[PDB]
Design a protein around this nucleic acid. Structure first.
Lengths: 232, 197, 190, 170, 134
RNA sequence: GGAAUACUGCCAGCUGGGACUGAGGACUGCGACGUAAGUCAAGGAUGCUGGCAUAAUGGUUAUAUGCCGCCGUCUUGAAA
RNA sequence: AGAACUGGCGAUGCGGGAUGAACCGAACGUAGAGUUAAGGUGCCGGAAUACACGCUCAUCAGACCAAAAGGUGUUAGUUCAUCUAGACAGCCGGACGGUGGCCAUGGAAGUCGGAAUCCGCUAAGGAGUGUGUAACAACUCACCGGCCGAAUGAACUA
RNA sequence: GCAGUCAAGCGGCGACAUUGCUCAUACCGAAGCAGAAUUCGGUAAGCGUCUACUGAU
RNA sequence: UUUGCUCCACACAAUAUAGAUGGAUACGAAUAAGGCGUCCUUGUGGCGUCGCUGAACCAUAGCAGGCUAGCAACGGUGCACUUGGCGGAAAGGCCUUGGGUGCUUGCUGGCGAAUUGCAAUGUCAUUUUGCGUGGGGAUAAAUCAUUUGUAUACGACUUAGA
C-alpha cells in the first residue's frame, strides 16, 4: 500500500503491445528484398499533415513502418545480423525519429525532391527564431499585432492563466481582454528558444521557421554502397 | 557497595529507573535521584500528556480533598511511579521509601559528589533509534509546573563552575600523568608490570 | 525488504563549500552562508571527492528510507540558494480599495504593513524573517519581490503575506483583493 | 534444532504384491519419534494408506555434506491456515539445509502465525548458480565487497550501576 | 575544502578479525570468512583453535584490525593469510589486547604476590610524589 | 587416503563441595579383604574437644516485624 | 426450549486463576530433607530487565461479537501484463483526411443534445477523455515517437 | 414488510445498487453565498427557549 | 526561684540503631558520536591514541597496630594555630600562604606478643538524655485579670495600661 493510484480515462483505443513491433520488425526485412534503393531520414521534427503530403506525393516510394531501435535490429546491428551485405554499417548511422525511406526511384530523383522541398513550421524548441517580435504595450490580440490590430480579434479570457503563469509574462485581465504594461519582447534572433519561448510563438501561430527532411546515407540492395550525400 | 548512591535521572526511563531503584530500596540500599526534571518517558508528547490528564480525572468523584491530589513537580511524578512499585501502607514499605530522596537538578551537597547512572534504564540503550520520546520537563510544565524556568536558569550556574573544577582537575591530572610517565620504566615500575600492575 | 544500505548523492558545485559533523549542516558560498539541523533524521554523511557528498542509511526501513531523500533535497536547496538564490514575486491586486504595502521598523523588526485592505480599518503587520529582504518592484504594477537565501524563510514569508490577506467570510468569486505569489524564480537566473 | 530424516514406507506387503512402491520422502524433525509421526500424517494426506497397514522400512539421518559453504536455498512450502492451503515459495541463505529450514518456521510463525503441524515442506534445493535468485532480499548479500556497519551497539551490563555513561559506538 | 567527520564505523567484511564474547570460544580470535545474513556471519580462527562455524554477530565483537582475505576462503587459505598478515602480533601490540592480559594477570596473583604489589606500589608512590611539588 | 571432533547411549570408572536424617540398642544373618589368625564402609553413629560453675538454651506473656485470615439454624445450584 | 446419555459439584481442604459456584493441576495423620503439576520469573511477588527469529505507533494500542467491508498504514506471499526490440515515471514532439460525419437550430465545428460511431494513410490517433468559447479557437489523455536507464504495473492471500 | 430481475464474489448461495403498493452563541469548509439574511458539514457540548456540608476548639 | 537557662572539654551512666565494619572517587554535551595529548590554519581544522565497563583509581604492612637506633629525602600525612579565597538550591561545606607538633612501611636494624589453651561479632561506631565538675554568655515573655469592638449565636478574635 501507500502507492501512486494509477489514473486512466476510458477510451476506445488501446495499447498495441509487442505484437505490433513484430509486424514492424518483419516489414523492414521484406522491403529490403522488394525495393531497390534504401534511404535513412533524420527528420527530428515532423508535422502529420506534412508527412501525409510527402507520403502521398508518390506511391512507389514508401516510408518504412517501424521504430528507430526496432529498425536497427530489423536492419541488423552486426554483420551476423544484417539481412543484406553491408547493411549493418548503414543501420548504425541513424538515430532519433523513425526516418527511413524505401523506394525504387533513382538517386537523382531522391536528392532533387528533398533539396527542392521546403515548408513552413512553428519555431520548435532548441532552435533560434529568424525574426523578432514585441507584443503591443496595451491590450493584446489573438495574433499579437503581426497582422493589423484592427482586423485582429482580442485574446479570449480563458487563455489568460496560461500567458500569466505558463509563459510567466505579467499579463492581467481588463474587461475581458488581456493587457500588459510594456512591449514584452517574446524572442529575438540569436537566442535559443526555450519551451516557454517556443510556446508563446506557437500560441500566437507565428510559423516563423522552415522545415525540410534531412537525409544523410544512401544504400542499395546490390551495389551495397554506403555513400552519404548528406544535405542540411 | 556505596553507602549512598546518587543516580542522574537524565536520559532514563521512569518505569525502568523506578523499578530498578524500587528493588534496591527494599534491599536496604539508600538511593538519591537528581535532575529528575530531565527524565524521559517513551512515546511522543501527546500520548504521555493525554494519559496524565486521564489519571487526573479519576482522582475522586465527590471530593478531591477526601482523596488523592496531583503533584506537578517532576520529582513527585517519579515518586508516584516508584510509590506504586513499593508495598506502601506497611512498615517495610514505609521504611524503604524513607531511604529515597528526589530533587530537581543537583542541589548540594550532591553537586560536589559523584553521581552514577543505571545502564539498563538509559533511553539510548533501550529506545529504538528514530522513535519519539517525551521529557518530564515539558510534561511537568504542561500540567502546571511553575519552576521549569528557575531550574533551568540556576542549573546553568551549576554547569558553570563545574567545568572550571574539571579544568583544574584536568590540568592536575596532566601533571600527574607527566610525573607518572617520567617515573615509568624504573626498577620498581618495571617490576610492577610483571605482576600486572 | 529492509534495505541493508541506501545511498544518495549530492553534487557540490565548486563555488560552494560544506562542512559536516554531528548533524548540523553548514553551507558557504558567494552569496553567504546557511545552517541546518538534521540531528532528528539520523543520516550519515561522507565526503567522496569534495564534489559529491554521500548520505547513507543502514538497515533503513520504508519509513526511514523515505526520509533519506529529504536530506538531499534540503541540502540541495541550501546549495542552490547560496549559488542561485531564490526570488519569490508577488502581486497585490485589488478591485476597488487600493492595497498599500509599506515597511515600518517598530523595535527594529522592519515589520511589513498592509493598509486599506478591502477598506478594513485594521492595519495588518507581517513579520520579516532573518535573511529575506523585501524590494518593491519598479515600473511593475502592484508587484512586490521577496529575495533571500533560505527557501524556508523566503517561502514562509510569502505564505504569511498571502494568508493574512484572507477575505473574511465573503464570496471568493466576487472578491479578488489579496496577495498571490506570481512567480518563484531565482535571483541570478541563467 | 531439527534434524533431517529420510523415511520410507511400503504399505506392508501382501501375497501376490511383493515389494510395493516404497514411497520415499525426507522429513525434518527434532527426533526420530517426531519424524515418524509426521511421515504417517503426510501419507494419509497424499496416499490413502493408513498407519495401521503401513510400516517404516528404515530411517537414517542425512547430515549436510559441507557445513561450511554458504549456500542459497530455494524452498517450496505448503502451509495451512484459516483459508485453504496455499502454495508458497521462499529463498533462504544459510550454511545447511537443517539451519535454513529452521529459520523458515520462525518466519512463518511471525509473518503468518503458522506452526510446525500446519507447515508442509515440499522441497528444498540449492541455488547452484548465482543470478538465479529472484527475491531482492537475497540478492542484497551477493554484491561484491559488501561492507556494512552495526550502528548503535549495546553492551549488556552485568552490574546494576555504571559510572561511565556508556556510548553505543562500534 | 569541504569537511566530513571520520564516521569511522567498524564494518563487517571478508578478512575482518573479531573476538568471540560468549560460548566455548570466549576470548579467542576469529576471522570473518563470508557473511551469511544481516545477523549471522561465518568465521574461522584456525590459529586460535576455534573450529570454523557460523555465529550470530550478537555473540561476537568486531576488532579494529583487518587483513586481506578472499570471500569463502577455506581453513587452509585463512591460516595462510592469517599467518602472513601477522594479525596476532599486531593484535597483542594494542591497549585493547593488553588490557585483557592485565586482567588475567591480576587474577593469578598469589596472596604473597598481592602483598608484594602493595610494597612496590608504595615505593613508586614515594618517587612519584617526591617528583611532584618541585 | 587416514585421523579425530560434535550427538546419542554405557561404565557393577575415578574424584571433591554443600543440605537433612543418627531412627534400632549384648552376638546370632547375607557379604568383602586376608593363605591364615583376624579386620571391615557387611541387617540404622561412632571417636575426641570448647565454653557453659556469671550456670544458660529454653517455658508463659505484652508489643513489634514478613505472610494469611462474626458467629448458631435453613432454603436453593453455591454464595445468598 | 425440550426427551434421554456421560462427566464436575452436591459431603471438599491445597497451589494458580489480581477476588470470584461450575476454570487448570492436585483427593488431606504430625514432622525434616529434595523434584515437580497448573502459574510465573521489571516491582508489589519467591524466580533470568535470558537467548534466537520475525511482527506494531495505536490522539484510552496491545496484554480483556454488531467486524461483511473502509484506510496513499505496515510486513511476507499468490495469479497475470511488459522488459536492454529500452519495463515505470518525468519532460518534448506528433496527436491527421474525409469532416464543420447525419438530425433537432440563431450555434453543438469531438467535448448543451438523439442513432451509427464508418474510413485512408500512418508511428499512433477515439465522428474524440476532460479543461475550455456565445460558436470557433487553444490546452490535455489514449495512442505512438525523441532524451533518459531495469525492473516495473494490475487484482488478490495471509 | 411481501414478491421479482441482475450479480462482486462464496461454491448450488449471495452485499449495495434493483422493479411492483405501502438548532438562538462562537470558529472553520462547501452552497448563483452580488449585499443582507440563509441552509448544509465539523469543532466547543459552550449556551437557552451514621454520614455529606459548615462554624469552633 | 538556695545560681535558675544555655555554649564548650570530659566523668559515669543510661535510650535505642529498617542496620559502618577502608574511601557516595563531583564537568558538560552527542549516542548515525565523543574523551585525553599535540600542532597552527584557533576552526564543524590536522595529527597520535582510549572505550568493547568499576576485574577500575586511591588506600592498604606495625599489640584493633607497641617500645626503641640509624640511612635517604624535606616530600606524604593526623592534630591544633593562622593568611586568603570560593560556595545561598537545602550555602552549614570546599579549598590555599606561614610556621608548630606526632607518624612516615621510602630504606636497614634491636626487643614484646603466648595460658582467649582448636572458634564463639569476642565488645574498637552511631542519635538522644541526666546527674557532675571546670571555663564562658545573656539575664524574657504569653496566658488569666481590668477594659474594648473594626468583632461576636456560644466559643473565638482584634484594642489600651508600671
Amino acid at each position: 500500500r501507500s502507492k501512486r493510484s494509477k489514473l486512466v480515462t476510458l477510451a476506445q483505443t488501446d495499447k498495441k503491445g509487442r505484437e505490433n513491433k513484430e509486424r514492424i520488425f518483419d516489414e523492414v526485412r521484406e522491403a529490403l528484398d522488394t525495393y531497390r534503393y534504401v534511404w535513412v531520414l533524420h527528420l527530428d521534427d515532423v508535422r502529420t499533415p506534412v508527412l501525409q503530403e510527402i507520403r502521398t506525393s508518390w506511391a512507389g516510394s514508401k516510408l518504412i513502418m517501424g521504430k528507430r531501435k526496432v529498425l536497427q535490429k530489423a536492419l541488423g546491428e552486426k554483420r551476423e545480423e544484417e539481412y543484406k551485405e553491408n547493411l549493418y554499417q548503414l543501420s548504425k548511422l541513424c538515430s532519433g525519429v523513425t526516418g527511413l525511406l524505401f523506394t525504387d526511384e533513382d538517386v537523382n530523383t531522391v536528392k532533387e525532391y528533398f533539396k527542392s522541398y521546403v515548408r513552413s513550421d512553428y519555431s520548435r524548441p532548441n532552435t533560434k527564431a529568424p525574426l523578432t517580435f514585441t507584443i503591443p504595450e496595451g491590450i493584446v490580440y489573438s495574433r499579437g499585432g503581426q497582422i493589423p490590430a484592427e482586423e485582429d480579434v482580442p485574446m479570449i479570457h480563458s487563455l489568460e492563466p496560461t500567458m500569466r503563469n505558463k509563459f510567466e509574462i505579467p499579463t492581467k485581465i481588463k474587461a475581458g481582454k488581456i493587457t500588459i504594461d510594456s512591449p514584452y519582447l517574446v524572442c529575438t534572433e540569436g537566442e535559443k528558444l526555450d519551451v516557454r519561448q517556443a510556446l508563446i510563438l506557437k500560441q500566437f501561430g507565428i510559423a516563423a521557421s522552415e522545415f525540410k527532411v534531412k537525409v544523410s546515407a544512401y544504400y542499395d540492395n546490390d551495389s551495397s554502397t554506403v555513400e552519404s550525400t548528406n544535405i542540411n | 557497595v556505596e553507602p549512598v548512591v546518587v543516580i542522574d535521572g537524565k536520559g532514563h526511563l521512569v518505569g525502568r529507573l523506578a523499578s530498578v531503584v524500587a528493588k534496591q530500596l527494599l534491599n536496604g540500599q539508600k538511593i538519591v535521584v537528581v535532575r529528575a526534571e530531565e527524565l524521559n518517558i517513551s512515546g511522543e508528547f501527546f500520548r504521555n500528556k493525554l494519559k496524565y490528564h486521564d489519571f487526573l480525572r479519576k482522582a475522586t468523584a465527590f471530593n478531591k480533598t477526601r482523596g488523592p491530589f496531583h503533584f506537578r513537580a517532576p520529582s513527585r511524578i517519579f515518586y508516584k511511579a516508584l510509590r506504586g512499585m513499593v508495598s506502601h501502607k506497611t512498615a517495610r514499605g514505609k521504611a524503604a521509601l524513607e531511604r529515597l530522596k528526589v530533587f530537581e537538578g543537583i542541589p548540594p551537597p550532591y553537586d560536589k559528589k559523584k553521581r552514577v547512572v543505571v545502564p539498563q534504564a538509559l533511553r539510548v540503550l533501550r529506545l529504538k533509534p528514530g522513535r519519539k520520546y517525551t521529557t518530564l520537563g515539558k510534561l511537568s510544565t504542561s500540567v502546571g509546573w511553575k519552576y521549569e524556568d528557575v531550574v533551568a536558569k540556576l542549573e546553568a550556574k551549576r554547569k558553570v563552575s563545574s567545568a572550571e573544577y574539571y579544568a583544574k582537575k584536568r590540568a592536575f591530572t596532566k601533571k600527574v600523568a607527566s610525573a607518572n610517565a617520567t617515573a615509568a620504566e624504573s626498577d620498581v615500575a618495571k617490576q610492577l608490570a610483571a605482576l600486572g600492575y | 525488504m529492509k534495505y541493508i544500505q541506501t545511498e544518495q548523492q549530492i553534487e557540490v558545485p565548486e563555488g560552494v563549500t560544506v562542512s559536516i559533523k554531528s548533524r548540523i549542516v553548514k553551507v558557504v558560498g558567494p552569496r553567504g552562508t546557511l545552517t541546518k539541523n538534521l540531528k532528528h533524521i539520523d543520516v550519515t554523511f561522507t565526503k567522496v571527492n569534495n564534489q559529491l557528498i554521500k548520505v547513507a542509511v543502514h538497515n533503513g526501513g520504508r519509513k526511514h528510507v523515505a526520509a533519506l531523500r529529504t536530506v538531499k533535497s534540503l541540502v540541495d536547496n541550501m546549495i542552490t540558494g547560496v549559488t542561485k538564490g531564490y526570488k519569490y514575486k508577488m502581486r497585490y491586486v485589488y478591485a476597488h480599495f487600493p492595497i498599500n504595502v509599506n515597511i515600518v521598523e517598530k523595535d527594529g523588526a522592519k515589520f511589513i504593513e498592509v493598509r486599506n485592505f478591502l477598506g478594513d480599518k485594521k492595519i495588518r503587520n507581517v513579520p520579516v524573517r532573518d535573511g529575506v529582504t523585501i524590494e518593491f518592484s519598479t515600473n511593475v504594477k502592484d508587484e512586490i519581490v521577496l529575495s533571500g537565501n533560505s527557501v524556508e524563510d523566503v517561502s514562509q514569508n510569502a505564505a504569511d503575506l498571502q494568508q493574512i490577506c484572507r477575505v473574511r467570510n465573503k464570496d471568493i468569486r466576487k472578491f479578488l483583493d489579496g496577495i498571490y505569489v506570481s512567480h518563484k524564480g531565482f535571483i541570478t537566473e541563467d | 534444532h531439527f534434524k533431517e530424516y529420510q523415511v520410507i514406507g511400503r504399505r506392508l506387503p501382501t501375497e501376490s504384491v511383493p515389494e510395493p512402491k516404497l514411497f520415499r520422502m525426507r522429513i525434518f524433525a527434532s527426533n526420530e519419534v517426531i519424524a515418524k509421526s509426521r511421515y504417517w500424517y503426510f501419507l494419509q494426506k497424499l496416499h490413502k494408506v493408513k498407519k495401521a497397514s503401513g510400516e517404516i522400512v528404515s530411517i537414517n539421518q542425512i547430515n549436510e555434506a559441507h557445513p561450511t559453504k554458504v549456500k542459497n536455498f530455494g524452498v517450496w512450502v505448503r502451509y495451512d491456515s484459516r483459508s485453504g492451503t496455499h502454495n508458497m515459495y521462499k529463498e533462504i541463505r544459510d550454511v545447511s539445509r537443517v539451519a535454513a529450514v529452521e529459520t523458515l518456521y520462525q518466519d512463518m510463525a511471525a509473518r503468518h502465525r503458522a506452526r510446525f503441524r500446519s507447515i508442509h515442506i515440499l522441497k528444498v534445493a540449492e541455488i547452484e548458480k548465482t543470478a538465479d535468485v529472484k527475491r531482492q532480499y537475497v540478492k542484497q548479500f551477493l554484491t561484491k565487497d559488501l561492507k556494512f556497519p552495526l550502528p548503535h551497539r549495546v553492551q549488556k551490563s552485568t552490574k546494576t550501576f555504571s559510572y561511565k555513561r556508556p556510548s553505543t559506538f562500534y | 575544502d569541504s569537511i566530513v567527520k571520520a564516521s569511522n564505523w567498524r564494518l563487517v567484511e571478508v578478512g575482518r578479525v573479531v573476538l568471540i564474547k560468549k560460548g566455548q570460544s570466549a576470548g579467542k580470535l576469529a576471522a570473518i570468512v563470508e557473511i551469511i545474513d544481516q545477523k549471522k556471519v561465518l568465521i574461522d580462527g584456525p590459529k586460535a583453535g576455534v573450529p570454523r562455524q557460523a555465529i550470530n554477530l550478537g555473540q561476537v565483537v568486531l576488532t579494529p584490525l583487518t587483513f586481506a582475505l578472499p570471500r569463502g576462503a577455506r581453513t587452509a587459505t585463512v591460516s595462510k593469510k592469517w599467518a602472513a598478515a601477522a594479525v596476532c602480533e599486531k593484535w597483542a601490540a594494542s591497549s585493547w589486547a593488553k588490557k585483557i592480559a592485565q586482567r588475567e594477570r591480576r587474577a593469578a596473583l598469589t596472596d604473597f604476590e598481592r602483598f608484594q604489589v602493595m610494597v612496590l606500589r608504595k615505593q613508586k608512590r614515594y618517587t612519584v610524589k617526591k617528583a611532584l611539588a618541585k
